[PDB]
Specification:
CATH topology of chain C: Ribosomal Protein S5, domain 2
GO cellular component, one term (chains A, B): cytoplasm
Radius of gyration of chain C: 18 Å
Strand order of the largest sheet of chain A: 7-8-9-11-10
Oligomer: part of a larger assembly
CATH class of the largest domain in chain A: Mainly Beta
CATH superfamily of the largest domain in chain A: Nucleic acid-binding proteins
Chains: A alpha+beta, C alpha+beta, F alpha+beta
Subcellular location (chains A, B): Cytoplasm
Protein name (chains A, B): Exosome complex component Rrp4
Radius of gyration of chain A: 20 Å
Largest sheet of chain C: 5 strands, mixed
Largest sheet of chain A: 5 strands, mixed, barrel
Distance between the termini of chain A: 43 Å
Family (chains A, B): Belongs to the RRP4 family.
Number of strands of chain A: 15
Function (chains A, B): Non-catalytic component of the exosome, which is a complex involved in RNA degradation. Increases the RNA binding and the efficiency of RNA degradation. Confers strong poly(A) specificity to the exosome.
Largest interface: A-C, 35 and 41 residues
CATH superfamily of chain C: GHMP Kinase, N-terminal domain
Amino acid sequence: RKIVLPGDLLSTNPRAAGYGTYVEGGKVYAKIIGLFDQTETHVRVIPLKGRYTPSVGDVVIGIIREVAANGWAVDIYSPYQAFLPVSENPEMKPNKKPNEVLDIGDAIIAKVLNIDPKMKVTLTMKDRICRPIRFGRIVAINPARVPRVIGKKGSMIKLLKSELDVQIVVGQNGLIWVNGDRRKVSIAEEAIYLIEQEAHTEGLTDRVAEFIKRRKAD
Amino acid sequence: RKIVLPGDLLSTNPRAAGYGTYVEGGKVYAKIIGLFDQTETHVRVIPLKGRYTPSVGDVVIGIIREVAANGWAVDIYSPYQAFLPVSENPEMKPNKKPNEVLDIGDAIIAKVLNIDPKMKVTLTMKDRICRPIRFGRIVAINPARVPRVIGKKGSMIKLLKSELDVQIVVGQNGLIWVNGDRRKVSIAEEAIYLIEQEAHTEGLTDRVAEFIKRRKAD
Amino acid sequence: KLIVDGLRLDGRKFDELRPIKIEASVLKRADGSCYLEMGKNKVIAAVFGPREVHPRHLQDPSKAIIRYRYNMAPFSVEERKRPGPDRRSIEISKVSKEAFEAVIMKELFPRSAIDIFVEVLQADAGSRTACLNAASVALVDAGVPMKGMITSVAVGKADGQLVLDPMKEEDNFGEADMPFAFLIRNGKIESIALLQMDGRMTRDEVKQAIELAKKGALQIYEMQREAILRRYIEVGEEMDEIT
Amino acid sequence: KPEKLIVDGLRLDGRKFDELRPIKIEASVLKRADGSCYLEMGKNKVIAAVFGPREVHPRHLQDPSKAIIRYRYNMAPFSVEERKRPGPDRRSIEISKVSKEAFEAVIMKELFPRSAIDIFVEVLQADAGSRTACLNAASVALVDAGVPMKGMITSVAVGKADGQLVLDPMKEEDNFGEADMPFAFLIRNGKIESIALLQMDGRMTRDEVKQAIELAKKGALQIYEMQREAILRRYIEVGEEMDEIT
Amino acid sequence: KLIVDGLRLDGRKFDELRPIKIEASVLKRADGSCYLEMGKNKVIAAVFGPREVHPRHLQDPSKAIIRYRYNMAPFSVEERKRPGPDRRSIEISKVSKEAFEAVIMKELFPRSAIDIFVEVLQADAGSRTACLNAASVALVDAGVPMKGMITSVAVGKADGQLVLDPMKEEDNFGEADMPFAFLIRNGKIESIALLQMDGRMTRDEVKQAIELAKKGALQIYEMQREAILRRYIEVGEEMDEIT
Amino acid sequence: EDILVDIKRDYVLSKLRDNERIDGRGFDEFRKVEIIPNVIEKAEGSALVKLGDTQVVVGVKMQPGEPYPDTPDRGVIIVNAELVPLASPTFEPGPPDENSIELARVVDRGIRESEAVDLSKLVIEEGEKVWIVFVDIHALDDDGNLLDASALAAIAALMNTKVPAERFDLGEDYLLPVRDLPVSVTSLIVGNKYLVDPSREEMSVGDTTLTITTDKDDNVVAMQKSGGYLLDEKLFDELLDVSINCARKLREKFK
Amino acid sequence: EDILVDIKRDYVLSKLRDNERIDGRGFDEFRKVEIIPNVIEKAEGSALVKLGDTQVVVGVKMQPGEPYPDTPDRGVIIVNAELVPLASPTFEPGPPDENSIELARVVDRGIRESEAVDLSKLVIEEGEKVWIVFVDIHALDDDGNLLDASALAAIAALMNTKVPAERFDLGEDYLLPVRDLPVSVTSLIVGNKYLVDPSREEMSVGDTTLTITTDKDDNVVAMQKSGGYLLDEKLFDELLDVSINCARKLREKFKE
Amino acid sequence: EDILVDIKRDYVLSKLRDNERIDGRGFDEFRKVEIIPNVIEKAEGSALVKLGDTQVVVGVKMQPGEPYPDTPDRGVIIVNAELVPLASPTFEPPDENSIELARVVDRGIRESEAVDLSKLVIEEGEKVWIVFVDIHALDDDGNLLDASALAAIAALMNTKVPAERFDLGEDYLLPVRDLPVSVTSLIVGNKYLVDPSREEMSVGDTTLTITTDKDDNVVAMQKSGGYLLDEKLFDELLDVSINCARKLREKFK
């Protein structure tokens, strides 16, 4: 699968155009560096770098920035602002005041519900994986490095979830949540940071297992 | 009772640390200049200087600064901000709006209901003494000078109230409300200010008597 | 005499660029970066992707604002320069800022800012031009949406003959200096993003200059591609494997 | 220009190696400030003012979890032999920075969120150590202003003249010595608790540095009783008034 | 000698103004404007009606704030002037601004700002005075509410004798210069809005100076009325026809 | 932020689609020009120019001074501009902005690159004294295209400058010898269309322009593209010639 | 203290209605004045003056320099003020305000227009070296009327200045030749009433003042109206005389 | 970023508690150092220094000029820094920090007398050599101070006096007699982290710098940040610092 650069003519039919591309004069062009992704239904460009641009359905871990009676302003770690409406947090029973369920500084994992034209992002917690982070730990790594900690078919997180018997929810924005035996949760942190700095991803899956190995020793 | 300075050792038992002190290394030290009061419940330091720092139960005189539905924002003249909710103003009725009860400029007399972790002070007017001021006059003295104006065991304001047949309410923040017959209020006013500037206070109460007379005669 | 027997001082032909070297992703704390050498020019560009513009009054509600800063190190000139902007620095920053405003897809980031910092460590003729080429690579390197790439070079005029990428002696004694910047899409010159000119030229020499310029721009364009791809072959493969 | 700064065991101004210069301290001298102090240290004449926790206004510098501390050292144009152009200079800004940090380590800013404590110190007449003198003054003003502090801050410098370490150096020892090292400690119940300020310029050995600290610690305690006396003396009356009322 | 044979250098008597020419409304993009010539002074005033003050912290919640700026073009003096404000421009701006603060009903426009700009294209003695008279007309032309008109003129003291509207020679070699500005309603001096004095005067000379100044002010006042009325005949008629 | 811009912007774009300018003039026609020299008697040189309802004054001041350490054989010309807040409600009161600085640089490039003033002819002492020419541009009314109005005004002011020799006891006064006549033509570029000599209202569309400066023999001597937009090479080819033709017509007013 | 000013502003106004002043002084009497020379030994001249509870320090420094190409037969006097944050919470900790500039200028006009220093006696070398006198004002406590307090400190400091000739090898040190005593009298104007030497609390009514400076022979050498208000010509006529008188009593203090 | 630095901050603190650094370094070891001279041919002297991923370039420009009235027999050395916004989005387009960074560098060079200024005189009270040392941050990943100090002395050592250019004779090396080296440590409680990284710094800007000369004498010291320094810790870090400087001093042989 070939690499393309902004300005590169990708396709001749604009109705197939998706992420990372743009249309002008009946032609489709790439607007970001990345892998060319063309199928029968679409023509896209898979990103390699940049900051987190959210898309409908993404799981994300956020920090409540501001409180309101209609909801909360949540920080996604992206140039796009987000807000969780009171109507979308099932843990808040009517009689409760918004500042009794979630307050400034608290952590939560939600889902990208909707992205309006003005670029606002509406968050929701009405889902299985979603939940308030009352306990555990948070890890933050570059978003462009997220697909690497998850790996091919989830092979990386699996190694981590399994080999350390810890709970892990990787947010697309680069914020990750880990829970379990404190001794084991720390090893997870260490390994995720190594994976993030890793300059050469040759047999990274194997080196990580060898790290969690020696690391479990002490 | 001697004067202690910040950093002075007051007690070895930290279960006794009271107002104006702090615990470090399992010991109690004074943090402000003041009178060391030794009792058998606390090891406090009565302050002698500084800006006003409210405490639950204080009767303070504030001024309306901002208007809203949830309540009123009031300046009590201190580094701590204060708010008067609608839920705590007896005169408040569901009929008319809050705007028609108190405007961005009125003077009230209230009690400090609660001061939370963020140093946000919550006021209340649901008290026998509380009432919106719309009569008399307001005098303002330095808060560190209010214990002199009240005098020993209330000695002082009792002397003022009686010899001048005047109504007086000393706020802790330093704002005092005086009411009565124009001419008598003016003399009480004058006396309070002169009491605030007094250089030597040994025999101040009798001296204020000869003043209440000389001004009541001539 | 600048031109002697079809040759310029440095020794090259009228239609030849000076030696160029380009390197992407060289700074760790920047969202995007590029080191670039264009003759005796040594420049380094960094970019800090769509971020929160804190001085709230300069916050656009419908698109991102673009800030570009051109700056010379006090040691990049023959004679030590006092640090700080000058009227020249401010004008270069402005025209460069506009070159990317025309190419960046600012509508994608309301209330945010994209700051572009460019420093010339050692100067010679065309640093302005060296810097634009480095900024373009740095912007791609940070992953900010653009309509295409921006390539820049200048045309001069010595002994009455148009020359590509003029050197110092040529800019100091020639009859004209004309820096250009083009938007390039899929190996073709689309339109111009920057055009400035000081000198004395005929209507006919200006058109020729655009042609000479376009020829040099495409050459630099292939070096920009090679620099980027070279630097990205590995992550591309990794992503391809994972995805 | 000077030869032999330490002649016959004595310095040019006549004192021994371990003695401070004459000192005068006055608390509560300004009316408009929340706290203030007048302090003389040698030819030094400095004045400190403190503006109690006040509401910081440009809400972009306002910290939401604690008070921010501001300190500004400034020399009056007439404080030095040659008239000094009014305005901050690189060294003024640095002294102000190092001094601010010195108090951030002692003031309990956690008690005044969104507020600011401004400390302004002006040197009306300069001599060596004007920077140490200001801190000593600043400490008293803060106390006098009622701001909560872990303890008191006392400062003094140690110089090195003709191989000899000297307390509170004078202009000559500073302008022709081999080292100048200003210190500042947090003192509690008459005990040097820890270091708050430390800077050195010159040439010293690992062994001389350690000797400077002990030299500095002795002078510091001396200056610390002068700070107490100045304070107590000033407050004896009001203290008694409060004990009679309270 | 300054005053020889009862007459002054420029040839006028002690109680006479220099030539004056006023033109109301001369700027198209201003809210109000005025071109004023007083002696060798060529100054122009522009006012920008109650607008929103933007650096939000300067915004006064119960009334309009007034901002005045006196400025001299670098080519208005004998020796080219380095552009920008100096200490006396700052004081002239402050004092002039206080004069209008006492006449404009700024209480009608809370949170708003009324900006008055005055530029001296050619400077002579009394420019301070010329600008005030110009600004006063621009304020009326801008349609902002006022208690009345403000008129200004200065009184110098040459050879121990008081003179109205001193010229440069009298300012540079006299014994005193005293600028005034009064509020004038129905052709009557109501009170003083600006007062400043430099020199050496006797308690009686001061008292007479006020008298001399009031005389010149009414004269300048009628010129201010002529200028404005002349200019408004047309729109006035237009409006009288519609209404 | 907005006042009447979008409404006026929508209107200007609306009529553009019909290939008309709101004032009805052609895409290659300037507004009426008035050049009035000698207006600031206290200046060595001076001129006021009216380009439509747009107005600007330029003052030329001269005083001997020392030359730069690289051109002792050359006099000095310093051009600066003040887009005073009195010219328009948008002009901020303070130091020069990016716009003030850029308008001055262009005015400065056409005079210098066309060598309208022989700087070698302004030396008094090889490496000690030479004449210093200050060209100060002062905006009075901004109704569009202050740049061109300034360029015309600047050169008109130089052409009427009188060297103050006698004032410095350096000889007898004389006219600044001007050998060329730079003129600049600024156009607003809206898409694939251009508008010569844009107005304040037309500018509501955006600050996207192209300025070309010519000398008396019709040679290009200075060019400057401004604003964040893309310039079609074919529009440039057309505007270049149109610009050279417009500069030629304007150069006639100086007769 | 948005209203805290209004609280005492009301008191001041309250008693103004009854035609009395807050601390009991008369509408034409200054608070107790105190002048103290030689407080900054390192300076060539200085003086500290306490006016009521207000305090100011002025220091004078001299050094030879080049004269103004226009006045090669005279010395140079420069006046500057630093209304430093030290004096009050309203004093912004930055460069010269619009108020420091005006204060220094008034003080400068009084000294310059009354010819208090014989500048012609400070020439060292016609057109080359001349003495340059720096007068720097420094507020310490702002309790109202820093201006008058400053004017007094300024001459008091000049009267204690010693030309430092020895230091610059130009001979023996000597008294700076002072030949007059400028004195300023500031009054707070409220409606048709004036308060001479207003205090910080009285200033609460507004910043509407009038300043008059006189010389030793009682002539007016400088006047400044400040604040945005209209001045009644009558009040001004009465005030003019009251100020000249007050100025004379203060000038007495200079006979030591 | 408040939390993002808080997240990492908590990570660093969390590991400090267990007595370990996040990159496995010992509490007294510097990251890898690379010193490359002559990177700016147009300068009289220059040096690029890499301390881990931290990068800095120092340029030395020399030219004749008039000396300080109080010292007509000594050349002049002026040090300045540009902690430009590249490689640290916290830098804004001089900081209160650039000043202190340049100041510390300056002090080391001046106190150790690394440059015999007396030998740069050209004419007693007129012409003297002015040496401009300009620091330029390229990539900030912690401790730009120590990296800048290494780059500064290195550039001076590669400095070549441009005598010919100014017709004052043959060119020659700048006289350098000493080797200032500073060592900065992060201080958290009663623990110290020598040569802190951008991440470790997230804990707070509370440091302590010490500079020594070739003979191991202390020539400058600078305590920074709002914290309290324990005397025992200071007495231990004193020796630790002098030892680290000595090892780094070996990279110059």
